[PDB]
Structures are given as structure tokens and as C-alpha cells.
Write a protein that binds this ligand. Structure first.
Ligand SMILES: O=P(O)(O)O[C@H]1[C@H](OP(=O)(O)O)[C@@H](OP(=O)(O)O)[C@H](OP(=O)(O)O)[C@@H](OP(=O)(O)O)[C@H]1OP(=O)(O)O
Length: 48
RNA sequence: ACUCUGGUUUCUCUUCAGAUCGCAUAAAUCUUUCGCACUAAAGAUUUCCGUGGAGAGGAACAACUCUGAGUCCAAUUUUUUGAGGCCUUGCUUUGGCAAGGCUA
């Protein structure tokens, strides 16, 4: 849900101006952060 | 204005760290609370991601910038003079002292 949140955060700043709707936005650092912080927590679970 | 420290980088270990150890943020478990728990909150513990400090060990090139330490004044106002000489008493430790008056 959080990554979708960040998509809504990023796209609606990305798709302003002459940029319209479309699949061209990639500012991937926010979601990539979120999934790495998930990997931080489940690394010792899957390791155990 | 002459001389002796201390370096910096990197790899690793050990210990302390409730300090935004992290200008970022996970997960598990337990307990509590209400719902009726991914869509929910509290408290606590733990594990992870991965820090600062100190100590130690290796190995790479810099070695005295830095942090330190050991290492030109005679004219009013101070350090280039108002300084020296005479008289009375108390005692003379008979050398003279103390006070006052002087004279320059
Ligand atoms: O917000 P979501 O439910 O996750 O859906 C979004 C949304 O589509 P909808 O508006 O129809 O809901 C975006 O559109 P806008 O928010 O801009 O209006 C669209 O982005 P673009 O239209 O700008 O391309 C995006 O597509 P994507 O994330 O693939 O870029 C799409 O996500 P979905 O792929 O899940 O439909």
C-alpha cells in the first residue's frame, strides 16, 4: 500500500506541466527503499 | 626568526554506546486494549539492516602546512632624576636613626 502511496506521491508531481498521464515515470528510489526496508526485517526470519 | 612529537588511508579484531547511536526505518515474539487484527493501537523484549567512540593488530605512502611544545622607548604620566647640602630633640647599636624646620 505504501509503494502505491509513493506512486501517488510521485506521479502527481511527475505528471504536471506538459507531462500527462502515461507509463513513462520512473523515479524508483522510494519503492526500492520500501522493499529494502522490508528485506531488512525478514532477512533473519528466512535465515532462521 | 632555529629544534621533537603527533600523521593520512585501508583491512580486521575487541569493548562501550538510550547519542536523530539511523536528519533513515524493518521484522518476529510476548503482554494489554478494544474491535469481531495486513487493512490497529499501546508497552516490552529480541533479531536484523548498519552506525559512532575508544582500545588493539596488520599493510600502504606521506613525513613537519596544521595542533602544540622545546625556543624599534633620554624632554611632564612611571625605566635615563630635583637629585644633593644646613639646624633641634628622643635615643645614640657615638655609625647614626625618626620627626619637623630649612637651603638649593
Ligand atoms: O492509483 P492506482 O489505483 O494504483 O492506478 C494507477 C492510476 O490509474 P487510475 O487513475 O485509473 O486509478 C494512474 O493514473 P493516474 O493516477 O495518473 O490518474 C496510472 O498512472 P498513469 O495513468 O499516469 O500511467 C497507474 O498506472 P502505472 O502505475 O502502471 O503507471 C495506475 O496503476 P495501475 O497499473 O495499477 O493501473
Amino acid at each position: 500500500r505504501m509503494c502505491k502511496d509513493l506512486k501517488h506521491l510521485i506521479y502527481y508531481r511527475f505528471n504536471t506541466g506538459p507531462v500527462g498521464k502515461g507509463p513513462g515515470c520512473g523515479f524508483w528510489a522510494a519503492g526500492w527503499r520500501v522493499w529494502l526496508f522490508f528485506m531488512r526485517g525478514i532477512t533473519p526470519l528466512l535465515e532462521r
